[PDB]
Amino acid sequence: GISYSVEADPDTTAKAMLRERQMSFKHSKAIAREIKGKTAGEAVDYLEAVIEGDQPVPFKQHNSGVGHKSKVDGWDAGRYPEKASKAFLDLLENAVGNADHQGFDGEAMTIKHVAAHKVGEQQGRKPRAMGRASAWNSPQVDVELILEEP
Amino acid sequence: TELQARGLTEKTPDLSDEDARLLTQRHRVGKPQFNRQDHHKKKRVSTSWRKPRGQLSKQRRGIKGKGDTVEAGFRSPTAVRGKHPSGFEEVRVHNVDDLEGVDGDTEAVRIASKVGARKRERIEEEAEDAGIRVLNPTYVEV
Amino acid sequence: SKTNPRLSSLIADLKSAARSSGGAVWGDVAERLEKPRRTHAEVNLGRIERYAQEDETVVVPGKVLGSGVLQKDVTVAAVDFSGTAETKIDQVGEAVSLEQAIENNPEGSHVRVIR
RNA sequence: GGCGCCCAAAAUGAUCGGGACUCAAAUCCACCACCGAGACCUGUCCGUACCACUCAUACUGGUAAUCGAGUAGAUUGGCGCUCUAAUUGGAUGGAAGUAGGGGUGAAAACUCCUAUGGACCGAUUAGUGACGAAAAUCCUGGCCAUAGUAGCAGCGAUAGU
RNA sequence: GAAGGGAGGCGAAAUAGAGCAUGAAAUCAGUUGGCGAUCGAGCGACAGGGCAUACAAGGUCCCUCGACGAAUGACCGACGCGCGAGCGUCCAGUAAGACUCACGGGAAGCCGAUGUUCUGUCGUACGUUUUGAAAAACGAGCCAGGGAGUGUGUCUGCAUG
RNA sequence: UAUGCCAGCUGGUGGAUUGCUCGGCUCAGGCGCUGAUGAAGGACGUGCCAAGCUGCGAUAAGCCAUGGGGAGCCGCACGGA
Ligand SMILES: [Cl-]
Ligand SMILES: [Cl-]
Ligand SMILES: [Cl-]
Ligand SMILES: [Cl-]
Ligand SMILES: [Cl-]
Ligand SMILES: [Cl-]
Ligand SMILES: [Mg+2]
Ligand SMILES: [Mg+2]
Ligand SMILES: [Mg+2]
Ligand SMILES: [Mg+2]
Ligand SMILES: [Mg+2]
Ligand SMILES: [Mg+2]
Ligand SMILES: [Mg+2]
Ligand code: NA
Ligand code: NA
Ligand code: NA
Ligand code: NA
Ligand code: NA
Ligand code: NA
Ligand code: NA
Ligand SMILES: [Sr+2]
Ligand SMILES: [Sr+2]
Ligand SMILES: [Sr+2]
Ligand SMILES: [Sr+2]
Ligand SMILES: [Sr+2]
Ligand SMILES: [Sr+2]
Ligand SMILES: [Sr+2]
Ligand SMILES: [Sr+2]
Ligand SMILES: [Sr+2]
Ligand SMILES: [Sr+2]
Ligand SMILES: [Sr+2]
């Protein structure tokens, strides 16, 4: 698995991390990109909005075939990853929690660092025509979050 | 409060007017990189030089732009070949006894990297006393 | 590339002589000894007998063997002698090594190269 | 006799490379000055061959206008890898390996610094080889783009709310 | 939530926490440097600019002037020719002339070097097949590791003993 | 400045590399038959908990004797009782 790839001063920071989550790695990469810099509180409001279908997540790298979304700004392609989003809400629920237990203002903290890392695929096999069977895997994702005092 | 390198870090060798001339030349002329053809096009192909063997090889046939091919013509001047850029002749050293016979006026010493801190200390002090520069000196805060 | 240290010094000696003294036979013998072994001489007594003359050191740029008869009182200098050649020769003359010949005659005078 | 004109029709967009040029930037007859190679001349260095000295193929000095391109192939010196021996060294005051960086060598390659690592590692000489890879629709393993794409509809059994 | 996460505890080390010594490349996430939405494709070599650079292992580099100064080699001026473009003689093998050095002044991202990018010159891979390969001839997605003159007997040379 | 290119940094993935060897490979010496007194092989059992291996055979990871050995033990296998 991963280790925090960025230094964090304990006296003004709170950590959180997801391990081997089976969800779209490509979505994680996009959601992370998007919420970076936001306030834990803001990020959560945002993700609930995505899940709800009210806010699109810009798909700038893995956008093949994706249709344009008007509410996307400065870009065209976007979607509403509800599964990866619910997983980041979990991450954020952990982060803010820890932050509080330490005496910080969880919600008010700035998402200093958030990044997803594909830890590996879970092997699957799908039977095909002509007597062969091809891969049918699930990506496994770790994601690191660092909350920093404003 | 600050680091100082042990030994005669600034010592220079005394070269004949001719050795100096040729040393300066070597430094002025330089030479091609001489890396393997197309090494930069395929990661699996390393920089180490291999004679271009292809019958149609552009480099092998000497096409201008494809890089120079290794020839004795590129050899550096005899009187200086292998000298440190300072002009000193290098002498590999593994212990104190290796410093014996070394001429600190034209030779400098390079302690093998395997040698430990304890034995370097002895070698470094003994070399300074013999007027010998150590190319890879230990830095201490004094 | 000679491997024998002795043959190697003998050659350096022959040169030193030919160059320093009036030698030439010595430099000529060094020349041949520097060539491959198959070219070196293998001479039996019979030949030394047929072409040697007293008061003229016979110089064999190789090894002297023992076939045939030697009656002449000649001094033969060679890289080596078989145990029998040295014996048959000493009976009527003298067998000496080139290391000695160069020692007494660095000018390489009055000599006859035999092969 | 010189130049030209007619003779003279082809398929995606015409052409002297293009622009464009008419006492020319055309053609012909003379001439003047320039640009332009690794050729030729010149300084230094390298290799090679030969000479002098020499044990030397080690130094040093000398000669080359009459040496310096090369596939197949012949010949020769050298780099690197494993393990053995002899001689001789390094390492917990941090070995090997790996990463980034400095120095040397035409080069094979050698070496140092910093980080990592945490226990082994060399050099010289003589040996020993299951000794060097960019290639074989080469092998095995791992991994990316393909792609959040195709499929998750089609069958007389449309199944749900 | 017997998950996972945060904090904490052990230990020299948990970046030794379970296919748990070391941890390369391909490659992925984040991020730094350089380039970047008017512009052209064997991806570079060589030369020269921009921007970038902790130490260490490299320490040089720029500007006046001066000395030395190979091949080459003048302007101006004077005289004399040519219809003319221009040339000849003298000045003069002079001034100039690459490199190198000395004096004085200067640079510390400063010089080398490394990264990237821009400019100039050359440039349609590599290996193979072939008279001819960028080839609209053949091979490989990428990387690591694996991957081809070996033994016995006999013969025939050769070098060494 | 988006999408992005080249190089590096931090962290992954991966398991090369270096180090290590409980396994191999080869050579040498010794020794050499078993079975109807039912062998070799196999099946199925057998443990407090027991799936695999090993052992054993309804006396079933064993029972007896002699000698050795010795304060420990209950196989591989570091659990609990
Ligand atoms: Cl993915
Ligand atoms: Cl050479
Ligand atoms: Cl004979
Ligand atoms: Cl060589
Ligand atoms: Cl010079
Ligand atoms: Cl062969
Ligand atoms: Mg679509
Ligand atoms: Mg079938
Ligand atoms: Mg490469
Ligand atoms: Mg030795
Ligand atoms: Mg290999
Ligand atoms: Mg598609
Ligand atoms: Mg590990
Ligand atoms: Na939009
Ligand atoms: Na918009
Ligand atoms: Na072929
Ligand atoms: Na080709
Ligand atoms: Na073609
Ligand atoms: Na594939
Ligand atoms: Na037996
Ligand atoms: Sr895309
Ligand atoms: Sr070291
Ligand atoms: Sr040549
Ligand atoms: Sr040649
Ligand atoms: Sr030739
Ligand atoms: Sr091999
Ligand atoms: Sr895939
Ligand atoms: Sr349906
Ligand atoms: Sr159908
Ligand atoms: Sr902890
Ligand atoms: Sr002059």
Swiss-Prot record, chain A:
InterPro entries: Ribosomal_uL22, Ribosomal_uL22_CS, Ribosomal_uL22_euk/arc, Ribosomal_uL22_sf. The keyword Ribonucleoprotein applies. One of its GO terms (biological process) is cytoplasmic translation. One of its GO terms (molecular function) is rRNA binding. Pfam families: Ribosomal_L22. Belongs to the universal ribosomal protein uL22 family. HAMAP family: Ribosomal_uL22_A. Part of the 50S ribosomal subunit. Contacts the macrolide antibiotic tylosin in the polypeptide exit tunnel. This is Large ribosomal subunit protein uL22. The gene is rpl22.
Swiss-Prot record, chain B:
One of its GO terms (biological process) is DNA repair. GO terms for molecular function: DNA binding; nucleotide binding; rRNA binding; structural constituent of ribosome. GO terms for cellular component: cytosolic large ribosomal subunit. It comes from the Archaea. Keywords: Ribonucleoprotein, Ribosomal protein, RNA-binding, rRNA-binding. The keyword ATP-binding does not apply. Residues 38-64 have a biased composition (Basic residues). Residues 8-21 have a biased composition (Basic and acidic residues). The keyword Ribosomal protein applies. Residues 1-87 are annotated as: Disordered. Belongs to the eukaryotic ribosomal protein eL32 family. Binds to the 23S rRNA. Part of the 50S ribosomal subunit. Interacts weakly with protein L15. This is Large ribosomal subunit protein eL32. The gene is rpl32e.
UniProtKB/Swiss-Prot annotation, chain C:
GO terms for biological process: translation. The keyword Ribosomal protein applies. InterPro entries: Ribosomal_eL18, Ribosomal_eL18/eL18-A/B/_CS, Ribosomal_eL18_arc, Ribosomal_uL15/eL18, Ribosomal_uL15/eL18_sf, Ribosomal_uL15_CS. One of its GO terms (molecular function) is rRNA binding. It holds the Pfam family Ribosomal_L27A. Keywords: Ribonucleoprotein, Ribosomal protein, RNA-binding, rRNA-binding. GO terms for cellular component: cytosolic large ribosomal subunit. It comes from the Archaea. The keyword Ribosomal protein applies. Stabilizes the tertiary rRNA structure within the 23S rRNA domain (domain II) to which it binds. Part of the 50S ribosomal subunit. Interacts weakly with proteins L4 and L15. Has been cross-linked to L4. Belongs to the eukaryotic ribosomal protein eL18 family. This is Large ribosomal subunit protein eL18. It comes from Haloarcula marismortui (strain ATCC 43049 / DSM 3752 / JCM 8966 / VKM B-1809) (Halobacterium marismortui). The gene is rpl18e.
